[PDB]
Design an enzyme around this catalytic site. Structure first.
Site, PDB file in Angstrom:
ATOM      1  N   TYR A  26      -3.462  57.704  32.303  1.00 55.92           N
ATOM      2  CA  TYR A  26      -4.041  56.331  32.067  1.00 55.92           C
ATOM      3  C   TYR A  26      -5.008  56.322  30.730  1.00 55.92           C
ATOM      4  O   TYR A  26      -5.153  57.239  30.145  1.00 55.92           O
ATOM      5  CB  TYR A  26      -4.938  55.963  33.393  1.00 55.92           C
ATOM      6  CG  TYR A  26      -6.397  56.632  33.309  1.00 55.92           C
ATOM      7  CD1 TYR A  26      -6.423  57.816  33.375  1.00 55.92           C
ATOM      8  CD2 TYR A  26      -7.434  55.756  33.282  1.00 55.92           C
ATOM      9  CE1 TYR A  26      -7.666  58.390  33.361  1.00 55.92           C
ATOM     10  CE2 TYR A  26      -8.612  56.416  33.281  1.00 55.92           C
ATOM     11  CZ  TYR A  26      -8.821  57.873  33.225  1.00 55.92           C
ATOM     12  OH  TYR A  26      -9.995  58.258  33.246  1.00 55.92           O
ATOM     13  N   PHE A  36     -13.512  52.213  27.114  1.00 57.69           N
ATOM     14  CA  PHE A  36     -14.670  53.231  27.784  1.00 57.69           C
ATOM     15  C   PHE A  36     -14.219  54.276  28.332  1.00 57.69           C
ATOM     16  O   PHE A  36     -14.722  55.305  28.793  1.00 57.69           O
ATOM     17  CB  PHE A  36     -15.192  52.522  28.991  1.00 57.69           C
ATOM     18  CG  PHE A  36     -14.250  52.285  30.141  1.00 57.69           C
ATOM     19  CD1 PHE A  36     -13.339  51.263  30.187  1.00 57.69           C
ATOM     20  CD2 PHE A  36     -14.683  53.085  31.206  1.00 57.69           C
ATOM     21  CE1 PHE A  36     -12.461  51.160  31.230  1.00 57.69           C
ATOM     22  CE2 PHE A  36     -13.747  52.703  32.449  1.00 57.69           C
ATOM     23  CZ  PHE A  36     -12.681  51.937  32.241  1.00 57.69           C
ATOM     24  N   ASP A  37     -12.585  54.490  28.194  1.00 58.33           N
ATOM     25  CA  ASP A  37     -12.144  55.676  28.800  1.00 58.33           C
ATOM     26  C   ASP A  37     -10.703  55.872  28.160  1.00 58.33           C
ATOM     27  O   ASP A  37     -10.030  55.086  27.921  1.00 58.33           O
ATOM     28  CB  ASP A  37     -11.934  55.651  30.450  1.00 58.33           C
ATOM     29  CG  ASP A  37     -11.850  56.902  31.075  1.00 58.33           C
ATOM     30  OD1 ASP A  37     -11.855  57.813  30.260  1.00 58.33           O
ATOM     31  OD2 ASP A  37     -11.799  56.802  32.269  1.00 58.33           O
ATOM     32  N   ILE A  56     -10.817  53.754  42.854  1.00 66.51           N
ATOM     33  CA  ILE A  56     -11.267  52.433  43.222  1.00 66.51           C
ATOM     34  C   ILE A  56     -10.071  51.634  43.782  1.00 66.51           C
ATOM     35  O   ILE A  56      -8.625  52.302  43.580  1.00 66.51           O
ATOM     36  CB  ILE A  56     -11.899  51.698  42.107  1.00 66.51           C
ATOM     37  CG1 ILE A  56     -11.048  51.941  40.909  1.00 66.51           C
ATOM     38  CG2 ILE A  56     -13.246  51.895  41.925  1.00 66.51           C
ATOM     39  CD1 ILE A  56     -11.601  51.368  39.740  1.00 66.51           C
ATOM     40  N   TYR A  82     -16.508  48.183  41.468  1.00 63.53           N
ATOM     41  CA  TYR A  82     -18.006  48.409  41.008  1.00 63.53           C
ATOM     42  C   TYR A  82     -18.450  46.926  40.959  1.00 63.53           C
ATOM     43  O   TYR A  82     -19.240  46.335  39.907  1.00 63.53           O
ATOM     44  CB  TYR A  82     -17.805  48.833  39.636  1.00 63.53           C
ATOM     45  CG  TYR A  82     -17.324  50.032  39.474  1.00 63.53           C
ATOM     46  CD1 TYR A  82     -18.193  51.261  39.556  1.00 63.53           C
ATOM     47  CD2 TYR A  82     -15.857  50.450  39.222  1.00 63.53           C
ATOM     48  CE1 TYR A  82     -17.493  52.653  39.289  1.00 63.53           C
ATOM     49  CE2 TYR A  82     -15.152  51.697  38.911  1.00 63.53           C
ATOM     50  CZ  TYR A  82     -16.315  52.937  39.167  1.00 63.53           C
ATOM     51  OH  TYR A  82     -15.737  53.943  39.171  1.00 63.53           O
ATOM     52  N   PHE A  99      -6.569  47.837  32.253  1.00 60.34           N
ATOM     53  CA  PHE A  99      -6.110  49.315  32.400  1.00 60.34           C
ATOM     54  C   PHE A  99      -4.840  49.257  31.691  1.00 60.34           C
ATOM     55  O   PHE A  99      -3.963  48.237  31.477  1.00 60.34           O
ATOM     56  CB  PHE A  99      -5.980  49.732  34.052  1.00 60.34           C
ATOM     57  CG  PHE A  99      -7.217  50.346  34.260  1.00 60.34           C
ATOM     58  CD1 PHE A  99      -8.145  49.457  34.857  1.00 60.34           C
ATOM     59  CD2 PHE A  99      -7.570  51.894  34.597  1.00 60.34           C
ATOM     60  CE1 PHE A  99      -9.161  49.823  35.238  1.00 60.34           C
ATOM     61  CE2 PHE A  99      -8.753  52.001  35.137  1.00 60.34           C
ATOM     62  CZ  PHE A  99      -9.490  51.289  35.378  1.00 60.34           C
TER      63      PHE A  99
END
Lengths: 107, 319, 771, 355, 139
Positions: A26, A36-37, A56, A82, A99
């Site tokens: 991912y 962020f990732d 999540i 979140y 995503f």
């Protein structure tokens, strides 16, 4: 609030069932676009078991809605992940997440 | 319980190894002698020769001088400085019916090793840290005085001339006060802990496979002995060559703001010693014989008394 | 924009340099919940990419290297460096085959080989950001990074740098030779202390320092280096001399288990020959003083005397000396540059001949290294108290202990907040049921565990911020002080500090000080006098003021302290009475000092009647309005306080055999205690009847207890005495036959509060006067 | 009122007294017994009369004292009075009344006297006594400047305050307190530091910290640099921008290095942070905050989330200043001990916006 | 002093204690303390159970449990030690130790007792028995 828009189609018939593991390569962003990732930078195919709520709620609900080898763009709403407080240090409060996943193998 | 002691082969082997290390270090490794203290100091001195820069040794005592001048309330106990205080101290103890000439070379080789330190500024390092003590009679001021003796042993002259000017350009009140502070914290003969030791001496071996470590208790009475003897032995060696200026310095620091008059302070310890030895007589004035521990105490107090009368008379050997 | 443009931007270089200081300072000192939060902002690949992009500027290269260790290789770094100073070896057979020299007098390579000393694993956790949030969390580990990939990259960047430095290029990497090596050594130094390098890797590292010596290009030490790069050379070389020392200790532990297994069969065969020897009797016991008459500690001291009266044969007494010559030659003593200590002593001295070094940090790290080689014997000695040897069946619980030790030392350096308190209590509560803390009390003392729990009680006391912490710490020390006597000896030494903070429910720092002196004549004889006068000065306060917490609770006002002052006399009644006997030297100085401040006594006798004082207590305890209105009743604490002032002085009464002698000092005290108290005051106290439970149970903590009577009977039976038959029978019918048949009635709660009172206080005193 | 004290006020600025004989010429001759003189307090500038009094109401009849050894019924000078050895008292030359006590043993002229008025003198130090008289020279200007400002503190304008007198007086004080150079020799650098540690402790004890804090808070209320400076006029309005910046430089020069004076801001910490966006001398106050947050660690853990949210709001309105990242780097740890309460207040505020 | 127990008992105690540990905390009930000693074969009645808890809330923690285990085995060994202590004197082992065979076994044991005190041991007490000797030693 789980919107899956396809990026490349997979097998179309193989779906993950419960009590099973997945391997997802991912990456994620925010609505501003700030990355962020990722997973490929860590060079590790991220794995998890479905159903057991390790990820999540917007993630695993997107996960079983994919085929094997498919590439999908997800959009998880604030209320599904979140919600009020967000992650400490990383994700701000009431943030909509974006995503890019890919089911590598194992259903 | 002395009869029910289990043998060694009944013990588990790991505990048997444990007491062995406490034994093997105690009887073999601690007993071992070696003379590395001289073959270090030569190469720290000779390496200034190479193909006005300071020597390797001369760099070192500069660094110890710098850590003694920073403004701190207490003097932190560095183990490293104490590890180097004795090594430089043992560079002179090798020389510290005979002929006339052969003792002069035994004398002058001590002035060689005394020159090997105090031309590198070793004289004022040992004078600064006494001012940096300010009375805290810890373990460092033990280890700094054994260096102070091995430089001024034998009554060297120019180390005193390297010391008077340092106390005259600086006007360092704080040395003499720390001198006066260590003087009053000198233990004397008591009559209370003495029988505490004696009642403690009624126990020889403690229950449950333990031994009464007689060095752990040690001498609770006058454990201050070898230190307080060493300060007066240092104090004797400041006027050994009858250097008349120290006879007028040690009672009056006339350049300074505030005199201390250590000569008077030397008298006041002696009086506190005087009643303390006299009341030890009155305890034994009724007894007939003296046991072993009674004399070891009394051997201690006169050995420090001979030190202080000798340190007294060098204030007045010069006229 | 491209980041290499910062090399000439010269303003956003600086502001992005100081941002990297804020990144290292936020995840500083093991803050591992935030250490995952930075792993988002600076990714894993782009940090590994920035380790070798040579065109980066100066202060930005030393940032991205030092950022890396401060988010990945620091939380594991401090915990392992802590466990390096102590050496815990098990008895595996892999341990049993460890020699000083490698078999093949050629000195082996430092750091190369097999070590066996226990160290905890690191417990990294991989970072993620899609995992759901729970909730107090237990902890967060340090975020992970693939180490086996990292060691090949770090070795390569060092390996080029020692080679490229010989080329003497005008454009060094990162703008100097200083920035080319300082951010690559302090990563290699902190991957070398974590032990994650293979031995063949450090074989290459030994080549890259000076290949002329360590071989089984130009050497790094010969290269001209600026001052700060010499500093990391010392921190690299300091690891290597410790690997010589830890190998030396692990050699000597391997020697002993081969030796004492050979020594036990020698003794047991010799004892069996002693068991069958009847040829002597007066000389037989001189051979029998060692076998079962001496302690086993004294056996090994007597057995090991054959340097320069030993029952050991010449065969197994020589190989120890053969071993002893193998060890001094292993150290720097020749005992009549191809050696590491030969290399260092050359290199460090030559560094002083290079220039006049100004940085005071380097001059300390030089000379501390140099002294370590020359007194190599004393370097072995000072570590040896931290040497301990355990059983191989205990390792599976011992490393579980050490990880629970490490969390405390991590909490030494962080200011305590309300979360890590629950980490500390859960840590300590997992130590005291780990079963090895008891069976090796030398080892727990050797690891400085008893020291560590003291300083976390220091930082909290400095109003009490966290009282639930400070109880469980002082509870741990009280349970520690009775494991062995020498552990109590160690805890005794911090008395004056423990005494300075005597100033509530639950336990206390003072009960640590009480359990440090109990049951031991050695400490009680060695107890100072200045350590005694502090105890009475806190007793000097309680008789004049009240408890401010009690009048905050809405209680009636009482001008003295019936609850607070009793927290000192229970200490001092362990200060003069031990093993069922009174001391002399403390008893003759507590009472000389207790009469300098007569306010320290209870003010009803400083004065009303002593039976009247307890009579004044029964009304204010039975009446709830005059009683304290919840756990503290004032009427139950006044009788309990005077139960403490009485039995203290009973336990300072000089013993009877000194009264048979004419010790005028000892009878001077026995005058004073008898002068203070009237005898007939006790008799009304010794005879007052009680609310016996029958059909209903009265309240223990608001009424008269048999322990109030138990203090008084000890006073008269130790300083006043029972002489004649009439005064024996005077108090006999009035006091106890009321209570005896009250006790014989219930043949129940206060029945067992009074059964043990009779069998421990009065039935002895009857048998004292039975003829 | 006159008092006595122990050793703490013995060293400080109050216990400094200078002798002034009646004759003008040859006043620095050797003082002899039976000589009349006046007594001056150096900081207050008052004359001792058994009270201290102003010089305008100090009369030779009211205040004229003398040194006698003991009361028997009785160019340069000869060296009469030794130091530490004379042990002599004081009494009025008109009244003969021995000053003696009654911890603050109140000194009073008493005709009975005692056996404890035999008192020995000690001479002061040259650098200290120079630091003494300038306190009086400054505070006499400053309180004159404060109440000069307080006159029109409520009355708008549709005496003259000392503008040019105060500008030069601060600038000498900055160079008076200037920290010594790093290129200096180490043994001399350390020696000059302990002189500086005295003579800032010698100021902040005897007033001179809050007195500086006052003239800020009478001046900071005029945020418009000219319009709210028009309460004075146009004369002092042109110099309002300067006098603030020099003031914060003084205060920052006071508590540099010193730990003891840094704890003096633990009560009015919020007074400092409330003026960060004041737009005049924004570097000035930020300088003061940086030096106080590195010397006394107790000021770290008294900081709540309302303070940190102003500092990030300072950075967002004053560019990418690299000094603001310093004070946040001091806010994490202190003395090698971190603050877990502060290490998250920064992180979940600064980072997550990523902007 | 908790050192008077050897290791394997504490190993057996912790094995017993963890077997009936409530949640792994090291807490047990007041009843389970009785059962765990009877799981170790020790059978004391509720009289020896009652005085032990009030010596130290219903929550028994493992150090609080272990300090009671020290005292229950300290008193039993304190009396059976002294008959086997007399065993080494007499050559048979009954109690008949001749007084001639004592003044070299007593100056040779390691408490550094000289000839005067081992004299002082004897004339303030033919062969003497054991029960007078355990009386004259304990005093």
């Amino acid at each position: 609030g789980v919107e899956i828009e396809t990026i490349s189609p997979g097998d179309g018939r193989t779906f993950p069932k419960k009590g099973q593991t997945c391997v997802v390569h991912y990456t994620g962003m925010l609505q501003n676009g700030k990355k962020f990732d990722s997973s490929r930078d860590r060079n590790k195919p991220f794995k998890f078991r479905i159903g057991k709520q390790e990820v999540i709620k917007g993630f695993e609900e997107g996960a079983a809605q994919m085929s094997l080898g498919q590439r999908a763009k997800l959009t998880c709403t604030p209320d599904v992940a979140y919600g009020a407080t967000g992650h400490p240090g990383v994700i701000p409060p009431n943030a909509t997440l974006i995503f890019d996943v890919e089911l590598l193998n194992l259903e | 319980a002395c009869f029910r002691m289990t043998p060694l082969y009944n013990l588990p082997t790991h505990r048997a190894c444990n007491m062995f290390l406490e034994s093997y270090k105690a009887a073999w490794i601690l007993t071992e002698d070696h003379s590395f203290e001289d073959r270090m100091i030569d190469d720290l001195s000779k390496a200034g020769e190479q193909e006005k820069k300071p020597d390797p040794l001369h760099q070192l005592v500069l660094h110890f001088s710098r850590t003694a001048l920073t403004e701190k309330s207490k003097l932190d106990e560095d183990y490293l400085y104490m590890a180097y205080a004795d090594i430089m101290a043992k560079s002179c103890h090798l020389e510290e019916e005979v002929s006339f000439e052969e003792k002069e070379m035994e004398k002058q080789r001590l002035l060689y090793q005394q020159s090997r330190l105090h031309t590198r500024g070793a004289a004022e390092m040992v004078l600064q840290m006494i001012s940096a003590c300010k009375g805290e009679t810890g373990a460092m001021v033990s280890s700094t005085l054994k260096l102070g003796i091995s430089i001024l042993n034998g009554g060297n002259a120019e180390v005193q001339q390297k010391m008077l000017d340092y106390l005259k350009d600086k006007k360092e009140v704080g040395f003499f006060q720390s001198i006066q502070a260590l003087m009053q914290t000198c233990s004397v003969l008591d009559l209370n802990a003495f029988e505490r030791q004696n009642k403690a001496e009624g126990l020889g071996m403690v229950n449950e496979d333990g031994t009464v470590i007689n060095r752990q208790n040690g001498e609770k009475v006058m454990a201050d002995d070898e230190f307080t003897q060493d300060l007066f032995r240092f104090l004797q060696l400041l006027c050994e060559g009858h250097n008349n200026d120290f006879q007028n310095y040690l009672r009056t620091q006339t350049g300074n703001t505030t005199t201390i008059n250590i000569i008077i302070c030397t008298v006041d310890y002696l009086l506190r010693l005087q009643e303390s030895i006299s009341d030890f007589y009155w305890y034994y004035s009724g007894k007939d014989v003296i046991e072993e521990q009674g004399k070891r105490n009394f051997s201690k107090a006169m050995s420090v008394a001979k030190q202080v009368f000798n340190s007294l008379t060098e204030y007045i050997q010069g006229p | 924009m491209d980041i290499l443009e910062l090399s000439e931007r010269l303003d956003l270089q600086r502001f992005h340099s100081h941002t990297l200081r804020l990144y290292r300072a936020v995840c500083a000192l093991g803050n591992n919940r935030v250490a995952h939060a930075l792993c988002s902002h600076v990714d894993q690949a782009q940090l590994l990419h920035a380790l070798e992009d040579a065109h980066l500027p100066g202060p930005l290269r030393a940032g991205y290297y030092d950022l890396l260790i401060s988010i990945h290789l620091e939380s594991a770094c401090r915990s392992r460096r802590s466990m390096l100073s102590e050496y815990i070896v098990p008895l595996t057979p892999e341990t049993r085959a460890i020699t000083l020299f490698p078999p093949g007098r050629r000195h082996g390579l430092p750091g190369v080989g097999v070590t066996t000393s226990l160290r905890p694993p690191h417990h990294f956790s991989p970072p993620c950001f899609v995992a759901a949030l729970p909730a107090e969390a237990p902890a967060r580990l340090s975020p992970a990074i693939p180490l086996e990939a990292l060691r090949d990259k770090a070795l390569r960047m060092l390996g080029e740098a020692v080679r490229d430095g010989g080329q003497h290029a005008r454009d060094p990497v990162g703008g100097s030779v200083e920035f080319q090596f300082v951010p690559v050594l302090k990563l290699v130094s902190t991957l070398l202390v974590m032990g994650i390098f293979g031995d063949e890797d450090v074989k290459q590292i030994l080549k890259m320092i000076e290949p002329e010596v360590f071989t089984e290009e130009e050497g790094l030490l010969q290269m001209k280096l600026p001052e700060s790069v010499k500093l990391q050379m010392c921190n690299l070389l300091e690891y290597f001399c410790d690997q010589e020392l830890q190998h030396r200790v692990e050699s000597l532990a391997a020697f002993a288990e081969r030796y004492v297994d050979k020594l036990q069969a020698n003794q047991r065969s010799r004892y069996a020959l002693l068991m069958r020897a009847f040829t002597m009797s007066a000389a037989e016991t001189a051979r029998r003083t060692r076998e079962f008459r001496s302690p086993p500690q004294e056996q090994i001291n007597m057995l090991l005397h054959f340097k320069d009266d030993c029952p050991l044969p010449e065969d197994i007494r020589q190989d120890l000396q053969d071993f002893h010559q193998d060890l001094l030659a292993h150290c720097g003593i020749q005992l009549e540059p191809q050696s590491l200590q030969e290399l260092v002593s050359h290199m460090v001295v030559r560094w002083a001949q290079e220039d006049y070094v100004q940085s005071p940090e380097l001059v300390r790290a030089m000379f501390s290294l140099l002294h370590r080689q020359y007194d190599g014997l004393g370097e072995l000695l000072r570590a040896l108290p931290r040497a301990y040897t355990i059983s191989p069946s205990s390792v599976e619980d011992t490393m579980s202990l050490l990880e629970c030790l490490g969390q405390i030392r991590s909490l030494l350096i962080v200011q305590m907040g309300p979360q890590e308190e629950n980490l500390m209590i859960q840590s300590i509560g997992n130590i005291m049921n780990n079963k090895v803390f008891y069976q090796h009390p030398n080892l727990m003392r050797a690891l400085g565990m008893h020291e560590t729990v003291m300083e976390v009680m220091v930082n909290v006391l400095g109003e009490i911020r966290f009282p639930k912490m400070v109880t469980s710490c002082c509870r741990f020390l009280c349970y520690f002080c009775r494991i062995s006597r020498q552990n109590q000896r160690s805890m005794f030494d911090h008395l004056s500090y423990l005494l300075e903070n005597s100033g509530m429910q639950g336990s206390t720092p003072l009960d640590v000080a009480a359990a440090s002196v109990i049951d031991n004549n050695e400490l009680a004889l060695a107890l100072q006098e200045q350590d005694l006068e502090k105890v009475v000065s806190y007793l000097a306060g309680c008789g004049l003021q009240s408890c401010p917490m009690l009048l905050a609770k809405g209680y009636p006002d009482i001008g003295w302290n019936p609850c607070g002052g009793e927290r000192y006399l229970d200490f001092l009644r362990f200060a003069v009475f031990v093993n069922g006997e009174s001391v002399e030297e403390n008893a003759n100085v507590v009472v000389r000092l207790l009469i300098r401040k007569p306010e320290c006594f209870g003010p009803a006798l400083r004065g009303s009647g002593l039976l009247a004082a307890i009579e004044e207590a029964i009304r204010i305890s039975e009446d709830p309005a005059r009683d304290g209105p919840n756990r503290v009743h004032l009427g139950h604490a006044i009788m309990s306080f005077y139960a403490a002032l009485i039995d203290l002085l009973g336990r300072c009464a000089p013993e009877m055999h000194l009264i048979q002698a004419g010790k005028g000092e000892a009878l001077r005290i026995r005058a004073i205690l008898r002068s203070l108290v009237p005898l007939d005051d006790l008799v009304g106290i010794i005879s007052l009847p009680l609310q016996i439970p029958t059909l209903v149970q009265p309240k223990m903590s608001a009424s008269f207890v048999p322990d109030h009577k138990a203090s008084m009977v000890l006073f008269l039976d130790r300083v006043y005495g029972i002489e004649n038959q009439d005064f024996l029978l005077h108090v006999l019918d009035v006091g106890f036959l009321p209570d005896m048949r009250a006790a014989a009635s219930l043949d129940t709660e206060m029945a067992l509060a009074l059964n043990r009172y009779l069998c421990l206080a009065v039935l002895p005193l009857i048998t004292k006067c039975a003829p | 009122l006159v008092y006595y004290e122990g050793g703490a006020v013995c060293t400080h600025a109050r216990s400094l007294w200078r002798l002034e004989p009646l004759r003008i010429s040859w006043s620095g001759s050797h003082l002899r017994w039976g000589q009349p003189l006046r007594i001056r307090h150096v900081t207050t500038g008052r004359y001792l009369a058994l009270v201290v009094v102003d010089a305008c109401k100090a009369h030779t009849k009211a205040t004229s004292f003398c040194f006698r050894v003991s009361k028997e019924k009785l160019g340069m000078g000869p060296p009469e009075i030794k130091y530490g050895e004379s042990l002599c008292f004081v009494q009025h030359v008109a009244s003969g009344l021995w000053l003696t006590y009654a911890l603050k043993k109140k000194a009073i002229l008493h005709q009975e006297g005692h056996m404890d008025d035999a008192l020995f003198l000690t001479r002061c130090q040259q650098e200290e006594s120079q630091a003494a008289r300038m306190i009086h020279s400054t505070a006499g200007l400053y309180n004159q400047f404060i109440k000069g400002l307080d006159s029109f503190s409520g009355k708008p304008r549709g005496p003259a305050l000392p503008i040019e007198a105060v500008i030069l007086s601060l600038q000498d004080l900055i160079g008076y307190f200037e920290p010594p150079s790093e290129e200096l020799q180490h043994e001399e650098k350390q020696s000059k530091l302990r002189s500086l540690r005295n003579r800032q402790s010698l100021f902040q004890e005897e007033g001179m910290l809050s007195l500086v804090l006052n003239c800020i808070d009478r001046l900071n209320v005029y945020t418009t640099a000219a319009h709210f400076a028009e309460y004075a006029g146009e004369e002092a309005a042109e110099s309002w921008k300067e006098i603030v910046n020099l003031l914060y430089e003084l205060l920052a020069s006071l508590i540099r290095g010193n730990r003891a004076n840094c704890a003096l801001f633990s009560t009015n910490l919020d007074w400092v942070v409330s003026k960060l966006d004041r737009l005049e001398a924004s570097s000035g106050i930020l300088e003061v905050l940086y030096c106080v947050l590195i010397e006394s660690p107790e000021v770290l853990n008294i900081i709540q989330e309302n303070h940190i949210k102003s500092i990030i709001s300072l950075l967002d309105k004053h560019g990418r200043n690299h000094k603001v990242l310093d004070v946040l780097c001091s806010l994490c740890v202190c003395n090698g001990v971190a603050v877990r309460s502060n290490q998250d207040l920064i992180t979940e505020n600064l980072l997550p916006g990523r902007e | 002093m908790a050192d008077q127990l050897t290791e394997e008992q504490i190993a057996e105690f912790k094995e017993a204690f963890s077997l009936f540990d409530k949640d792994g905390d090291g807490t047990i009930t007041t009843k389970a303390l009785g059962t765990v000693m009877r799981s170790l074969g020790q059978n004391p009645t509720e009289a020896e159970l009652q005085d032990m808890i009030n010596e130290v809330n219903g929550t028994i923690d493992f150090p609080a449990f272990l300090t009671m285990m020290a005292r229950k085995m300290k008193d039993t060994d304190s009396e059976e030690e002294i008959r086997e202590a007399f065993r080494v004197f007499d050559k048979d082992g009954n109690g008949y130790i001749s007084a001639a065979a004592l003044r070299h076994v007593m100056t040779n044991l390691g408490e550094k007792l000289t000839d005067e005190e081992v004299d002082e041991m004897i004339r303030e007490a033919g062969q003497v028995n054991y029960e007078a000797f355990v009386q004259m030693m304990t005093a």
